[PDB]
Design a protein around this ligand. Structure first.
Ligand code: NA
Ligand code: NA
Length: 148
């Protein structure tokens, strides 16, 4: 059962392996919103993402791909390529990425921690059902965080 909490998703307070999953764009932009909250806590995810994008001519970077970045002994950030362009979230891309998060979280026995991007609007009304279908359906604990 998805938990809804007000908090900073970069600091989950639960036991066991934690995975913080969030939506990135496919253009290499890391400059507004939750990506800044991540860089306020750890430098690794941003460095990883920029390198991943820079080297896309030799690697898996693209819509629906996910990069897992270890930031603490039992904490990982999952940079999901889910958004096409910048100021537009792609349903197939987010679905695929969340499934990949689910695969990795299942093997790590991790819980998953996501910032909220409500169910009455275009974005979250696509995303939350894919959380249910790709994560909850597999028995993976999920917590969704509200913060500015
Ligand atoms: Na919430
Ligand atoms: Na709230």
């Amino acid at each position: 059962e998805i938990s809804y909490v007000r908090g900073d998703a970069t600091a989950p307070s639960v036991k066991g392996v934690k995975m913080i999953a969030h939506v990135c764009n496919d253009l290499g932009g890391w400059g507004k919103g939750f990506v800044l909250a991540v860089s306020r806590r750890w430098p690794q995810p941003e460095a990883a993402y920029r390198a991943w994008h820079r080297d896309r001519a030799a690697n898996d970077f693209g819509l629906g791909a996910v990069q897992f970045v270890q930031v603490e002994p039992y904490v990982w950030v999952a940079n999901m390529i889910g958004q096409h362009g910048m100021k537009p979230v792609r349903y197939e891309a987010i679905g695929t990425a969340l499934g990949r998060v689910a695969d990795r979280a299942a093997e790590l026995e991790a819980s998953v921690h996501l910032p909220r991007i409500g169910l009455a609007g275009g974005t979250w009304s696509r995303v939350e059902p894919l959380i249910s279908d790709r994560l909850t359906r597999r028995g993976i604990p999920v917590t969704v965080y509200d913060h500015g």
